[PDB]
Design a protein around this ligand. Structure first.
Ligand SMILES: CCCCCCCCCCCCCCCC(=O)O
Ligand SMILES: CCCCCCCCCCCCCCCC(=O)O
Ligand SMILES: CCCCCCCCCCCCCCCC(=O)O
Ligand SMILES: CCCCCCCCCCCCCCCC(=O)O
Ligand SMILES: [Zn+2]
Ligand SMILES: [Zn+2]
Lengths: 209, 347, 207, 347, 209, 207
């Protein structure tokens, strides 16, 4: 398909730009540069993630099943796949020790974000389970008998609705993190996240040697 | 027969003095850019390290000192002394000014330039695997260490650890000296590797000495000051959990943090500049120890009293004099710093 | 990865040859031909399934992760993929009305095989859940020994996928031994038409 | 300190003992063809001669000793000793056999091999411009020359004159020893340069010692023997004015002339073979000293008596033993002469 | 004339052969070779001088004046030329110290040969003076008068007789020396003579620098 | 040495010009000329001899041994050679009968010239003999300072040749000044015929 070819080439370019951005983040963090210039790189990184989510929504319209398969990601990342990506609560837990020290106010804000993320995650998981049973039940009927197109249509829209809701949850989680933390703390957390992803890619290579 | 031996020594020392007239076939390049000419046979015989390095390089010969000896930046006069001992078995003395500080009242026995020169020569003797030179300079440092200030004893202990098991006496002496004194926990953590910090804490707690823990919020302030987070220290002080006086944030920023961080910390004006620490140093004393001119200037424009002394009776002018070598008053950082200090003191 | 491309080509050709054998068994059952030729056609189909399992095992050696995803099948069949293939109990439910009439003995045999297949499927699915959770946690710790763990876990996945293909072959063997030639032929025809209808419906979502 | 200098000497001695392992850059080739690997820096420092020669050769470095010496054939063990002293400043004794003779009764203090080795080392020290070795081996030769046979003192005096003014004491002692004995004028003329013979004769005349006029016919026969003549001496002996025995022509032909000439003069059978000249040596003793097997075999097959002894009581067996180096009896002309005379004595 | 060109080339080759024979006798004396092999080389040298005198007689049969002029030789030997060659009594004195030691018989024989050479030299010198005076007188009357061929032929015959007799005297002096000395002594003297000629030619080159 | 080749070519050309000058005077003497015509031929012959002396001096600087050797002259001429040229008293004796009749004053002047030239000739001959013997002895000693002696003796030979040529021309010119025109012409005619007949004789002999 043209949409999937475009998505995979676009994703290659996203990965290259993510690498470059990280390489610039670490440099700025080491050179002990001031907050003002660093904030441009931070909001550029967030914009880049936003572009990822937008392009993922575009790919989701073309073929929701491919996005849910995780084939466009490396093998090791697939162990954390859930509706087209990673689990936000675990990535926040992963990065928490490196953004330390947090103030008491920041600590309360982060744990409240964690609780809201967990409850939203459970609700989306239950909704996806319900979708899957409804699809098994509706597909099963089509073969027994010799409306079917309309039902398939609504069912394609339901999958896109789920992936859209997951992308919205991710964008809200990013926004709340960008609002809780200072510029330097946010940069440190983004750095931790980037090194986490790069190490995962290296391990994914290592399992295929 | 001692006469013929001394003739041999004189001939090889004359070789070292003019290596182009006696077929020099190798060069040792320092970290500054300067180079010393030497002959491959002499150093292949006198030291095993150079024999191995030269046999590996042969598989006009240049040897980068920054690569073979990597754990301590050595000067030029120390390398000259070590190579002179390699050639002629004679300890060549350093030129005047290098092993002497800018304090005319200092005897230049335990001041910082002499300690630095002795450290450089001992590290060179360890890297080159010359046991007699190692023992001689280890004896020198063991004789002088009891008079040097503790902040330099920290550097001596660091280099003693760099020399591994070849310097057991110096390492143990420096460890005992550091344990007996009242060095801040942050200073040990930021001046020594984790192994030495762990060893010193274990030995201190084993002897039943006072090993107080660090306040968690104060430790948070210190790491915030270490990660260039002024706004973090501000948000934490908003909580009123810590005070800049009980945390000695000025001392930390002046001793270990960046210049711009300490400047931004001073621009808030929420801490007594003339406040002391458990070791007895004020902020101006640490500024003199760092030899950073911008800190000294910004401290004098904020009311820093330069007439206060330490527990040993040493003022800021004495610290500035004993931290700079006599070459700069006979990078222009030390010179400028001491000049500014002197100007302020005379005012 | 040339191995996965080869797997996709082999599986496509397997599907076409499967279609031919289903048509031949359809014509044979409808013409009510004698047991001997139908039995040859049955043995051809079983051999074809055996060849599918062999090539899938070879592909599993190349990349267990791709095989487990079930992506190499069409979208609608993916909803029924249990550990790298279909669930035998569900295909049995599918074919139940078409293998009729069964004798009382055949009914007892089918229900007992069904219970055993369900128990084996449930136990392997639980084992797979445990494997996946342990791999999740071990990768998480590793990122936050690694080579040895990678090798042991690849061996464990290879063993599980082999064991699942073992269950597929065992259930296929047991059912092919329980049933007469004509009932087995009718059931195989029903099974083939099930896949053909599934692929045909899948084509409409792509056209 | 003495220990450091000793360590220097040990390191450089180990360098000399394995030159290829310590980057040898020069090779001293001997007269026979053997090579000794040496380093340019050590010899450029210790020897000014080697510095000037290596500076001119540098205009892969080999030095032909047969060319820069070119005044005295030097063995290999003496060259090894001189280079070992240059490197490690210590003298190394030669392998047994070089400084020892074939006489089991000789103490090998003054026999010919020891004197030859001492002279070789002294000439090497003179050519290489090393004054300490010069003085040391000049002392050894001065302590030993008094117990050496005069025919070897001639060679010692020859070397002392060749070795210039660096051995004035040795030259004076040798001249005194030579003028004290009764060495013939012909042997002095044929064994020493013109200026030395003139000086010796002047000293002999001024000291009151007798210098007999050369017998005109004896001198005529000596020039005829020096020009490889065989037919001119039959006319001089046929003119009833000269005499082989009166002129010691057999001794002359065996000592200084060619082999063919002496064999022909002996086959003429016109002189007593067992005649004793002024010094007191027979033709058989001179043949044993010359170490030429043809003369010894031709003498023994014609009736040479071996039981006569010289003035000091030494027989021909002792001379043939004391003239050959011990490694040759453990050029094969020495082994050949000793074994031919031993086998002929057995018959 | 071709005859003088041939004479000059042959004389060059004579010098080359002289150099060869002298070098060979150097090698022979230095190797102290025996009298028997040495005597053939001595006799070869004497034969070579005999060939020189023969060829000089042939050249005289073409231009007696040119031979007498000595202009085919180099400048320094011309100080010693007398009637077409060197004066034997001085070459004998030159070589005498090198053949020594001589026996009583050899000394008496050589001194008698020297006396006879001296008397022959004076007699030839006087004969040449008388001949040249006769040529002055005969030329004077020939030009004064405004027989000539016969007088020319007679005077050329007289010059040819003088040159030929002088070359005979030279050859007889050589062969008589070869009989009064042994092979060894003769070789020594011939070597001295050859080195004399070579050093003389070298000095004549130094005077022409 | 190209100097001797150049000398031989210049001397050949001198001989050709001598032949021309002899022909011109022998032709003008037979035409019963006066004085103007017989004064220029003598002035040109004299200039030609002056050129002879200059060219001889030039050859003498280039080489002395060849010039003394006389090998550039003929055999006949050779029989008369003396220190690089002819003996003036004999050529004067040759020409005396043809310059007659002389006056008493001319006779006394000529006889005084003869005595002075004879004494100078004898002294120069003896000096050359003494020099030649001293060089003979010095060379004999040298073979059996040497370079200095070489150049000093070569310079002495060149100086003697120079004085002999000088004397030659001085004798020439004093004759050209003593005699009237109608006397010198007869002597030059006699001299020219003498040399031409002498060269003829030498040529004829050389065969
Ligand atoms: C300032 C941020 C620090 C690090 C925060 C990590 C927790 C946020 C989790 C969301 C990460 C989004 C990246 C996943 C992209 C995707 O799924 O396609
Ligand atoms: C001869 C037996 C006839 C009855 C067949 C009933 C269906 C058996 C189901 C098990 C085989 C599944 C076939 C496809 C396997 C796969 O897609 O990986
Ligand atoms: C056996 C001869 C020994 C040497 C004798 C040298 C004395 C004889 C002098 C005559 C030498 C003749 C060579 C000159 C030849 C020549 O003039 O052309
Ligand atoms: C005025 C002249 C009168 C007649 C003079 C005749 C003889 C003159 C002598 C001087 C020149 C001699 C010629 C010889 C030239 C030569 O030897 O090369
Ligand atoms: Zn000091
Ligand atoms: Zn001995």
């Amino acid at each position: 398909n043209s949409g999937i070819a475009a998505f995979e080439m676009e994703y290659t370019h996203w990965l290259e730009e993510q690498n470059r951005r990280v390489s610039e983040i670490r440099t700025a963090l080491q050179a002990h540069i001031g907050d003002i210039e660093l904030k441009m790189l931070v909001d550029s990184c967030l914009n880049h993630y936003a572009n990822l989510f937008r392009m993922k929504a575009d790919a989701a319209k073309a073929d929701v099943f491919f996005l849910m398969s995780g084939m466009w990601r490396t093998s090791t990342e697939r162990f954390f796949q859930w509706i087209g990506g990673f689990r936000p609560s675990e990535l926040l837990n992963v990065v928490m020790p490196y953004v330390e020290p947090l103030t008491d106010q920041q600590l309360l804000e982060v744990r409240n974000l964690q609780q809201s993320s967990q409850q939203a995650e459970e609700a989306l998981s239950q909704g996806l389970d319900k979708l899957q049973q409804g699809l098994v039940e509706s597909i099963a009927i089509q073969i027994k008998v010799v409306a079917p197109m309309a039902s398939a249509m609504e069912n394609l829209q339901a999958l896109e609705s789920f992936v859209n809701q997951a992308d919205h949850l991710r964008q809200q989680t990013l926004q709340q993190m960008s609002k809780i933390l200072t510029t330097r703390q946010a940069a440190r957390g983004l750095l931790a996240l980037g090194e986490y992803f790069h190490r995962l890619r290296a391990l994914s290579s290592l399992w295929a040697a | 027969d001692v006469s013929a031996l001394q003739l041999l020594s004189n001939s090889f020392e004359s070789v070292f003095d003019s290596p182009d007239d006696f077929y020099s076939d190798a060069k040792l390049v320092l970290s500054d850019g300067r180079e010393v000419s030497f002959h491959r046979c002499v150093l292949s015989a006198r030291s095993s390290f150079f024999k191995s390095a030269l046999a590996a390089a042969k598989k006009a010969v240049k040897l980068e000192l920054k690569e073979i000896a990597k754990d301590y930046e050595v000067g030029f006069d120390s390398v000259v002394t070590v190579l002179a001992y390699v050639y002629s078995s004679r300890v060549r003395p350093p030129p005047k000014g290098v092993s002497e500080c800018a304090d005319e009242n200092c005897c230049h026995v335990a001041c910082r330039p002499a300690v630095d020169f002795m450290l450089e020569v001992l590290y060179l003797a360890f890297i080159f695997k010359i046991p007699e030179l190692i023992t001689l300079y280890q004896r020198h440092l063991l004789d002088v260490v009891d008079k040097v200030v503790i902040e330099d004893t920290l550097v001596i202990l660091k280099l003693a650890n760099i020399c591994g098991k070849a310097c057991m006496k110096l390492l143990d002496r420096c460890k005992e000296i550091i344990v007996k004194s009242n060095v801040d926990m942050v200073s040990l953590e930021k001046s020594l590797p984790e192994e030495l910090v762990k060893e010193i804490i274990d030995r201190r707690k084993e002897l039943g000495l006072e090993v107080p823990k660090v306040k968690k919020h104060v430790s948070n302030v210190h790491k915030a000051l270490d990660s260039d987070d002024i706004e973090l220290v501000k948000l934490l002080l908003k909580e009123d959990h810590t005070n800049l006086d009980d945390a000695c944030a000025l001392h930390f920023a002046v001793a270990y943090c960046n210049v711009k961080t300490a400047t931004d910390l001073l621009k808030l004006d929420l801490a007594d500049v003339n406040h002391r620490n458990p070791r007895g140093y004020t902020v101006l004393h640490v500024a003199a120890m760092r030899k950073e001119p911008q800190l000294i200037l910004s401290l004098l424009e904020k009311g820093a009293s330069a007439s206060e002394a330490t527990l040993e009776g040493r003022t800021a002018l004495m610290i500035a004099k004993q931290a700079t070598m006599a070459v700069e008053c006979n990078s222009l950082k030390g010179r400028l710093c001491v000049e500014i200090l002197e100007q302020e003191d005379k005012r």
